[PDB]
Symmetry: C2
Subunit: 272 residues, 2 copies
Amino acid sequence: MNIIGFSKALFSTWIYYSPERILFDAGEGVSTTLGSKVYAFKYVFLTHGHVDHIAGLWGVVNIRNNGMGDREKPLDVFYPEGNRAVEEYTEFIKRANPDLRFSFNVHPLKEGERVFLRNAGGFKRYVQPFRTKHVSSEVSFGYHIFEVRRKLKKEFQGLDSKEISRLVKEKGRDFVTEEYHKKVLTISGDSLALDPEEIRGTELLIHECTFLNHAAIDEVMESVKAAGVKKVILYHISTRYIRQLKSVIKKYREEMPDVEILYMDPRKVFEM
Amino acid sequence: MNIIGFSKALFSTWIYYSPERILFDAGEGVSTTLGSKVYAFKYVFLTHGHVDHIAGLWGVVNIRNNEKPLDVFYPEGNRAVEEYTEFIKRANPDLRFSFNVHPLKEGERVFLRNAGGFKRYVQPFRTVSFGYHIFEVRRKLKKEFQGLDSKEISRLVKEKGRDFVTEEYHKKVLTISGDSLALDPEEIRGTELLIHECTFLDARDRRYKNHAAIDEVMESVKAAGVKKVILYHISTRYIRQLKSVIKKYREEMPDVEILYMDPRKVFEM
Ligand SMILES: [Zn+2]
Ligand SMILES: [Zn+2]
Ligand SMILES: [Zn+2]
Ligand SMILES: [Zn+2]
């Protein structure tokens, strides 16, 4: 599964994006739910430091440290620079359990700072944080996963199969293409409807939808519509608004046939 | 449900006992699973301070706070519980007065409010790790008065008092092992409900005697006169052998009700 996660507003939120071995947020229960799968984690990106987005980190590091043996690898954990709650909790984990001190590295990130990923299939993707409006208290980030790609220059897009192949054979691939950065994944974290520009072009939007501050579903769909996003996952949903949102979802699925709309049910583990 | 719990060895363990609004242990996920039921907690008793038994505590008080402080009891000397609760309060000023921790000495009783009856109390026993008994103080007619009729017994009670005609005895309503080896039959004997850890299904691969194997546990259940037992703290390795293994003992011991907490799902009873 490309994505396995769980999200219930105020209680716990965590999203495992398997393709890049990245865990976004770490609410309680992630290690219990994923088991030995936590050994496969290479990165943790935290949107912020509220307990429902970080309390599961201790279990992740504890299980990795006890179950990987001499083949354990340090877990890189990234969070919004200046977020004291993340720093206090990670310091407590290391202080309270010396055996875990070197099991993970905590890296504060500045907005816009890129982190290139190390996985199989090529060196071509990086994670990039953007500031979000949430508690107005501490710093929160949303994240994009970008993929460095190459596409044919406009002038060569009309050539047929044989013509483009002939040209590439003669002049090389780079000559007929230009590089561009595709947003392959966007996670909002807790925040108000993202600016249509922040989400435009993303192949998969994962946006909080706490209400029927945070964001209400209508403001989110409006944003998706303006940015022309085709695939969105709604999360950070509360249990009191289950059916109400569920109904508005089908309503939206009809009103927006070209857009795939999924949601993480606050009562069950999500998989895609 | 008198018991809603979840347990998976090394990952998370929490057992909510609704009759007394008591939560035993608080492994990660308890507030997420129980939701608003956490508002109902009257007490939390921790068997120890390993991450899989306490990481969910922050979540519980955070959700509760969002009304006297919740009382949290744990084994005296357990530094891990102290360090974690101190971190919660130091790092979250708003929760600083939301709960209180209380170290307990082995055998130290905590009488439960009740409706003012104080008929029930919790008592820890060593397994710093503690197991716990919930005791109910009951009364029964002294043997010498069993034959008196209604009028005769009331005349005696009037003249002598209720205490004179009855005798109080302490009944073990619930026993929770916490993490430990098979408990001495003496410790469990008499309990109406035993919830005992069952980390291994085969003692052969227990590099360290800090956990009980099912046969050993069943041995103690045998030696004592234990009615129903809920096996928990079960490891993932023995994920499927579970049924079988348990099916056999349900057979080799047809008088013993054997329930268990599947490491893959929340338990309800
Ligand atoms: Zn949140
Ligand atoms: Zn938040
Ligand atoms: Zn344990
Ligand atoms: Zn333990």
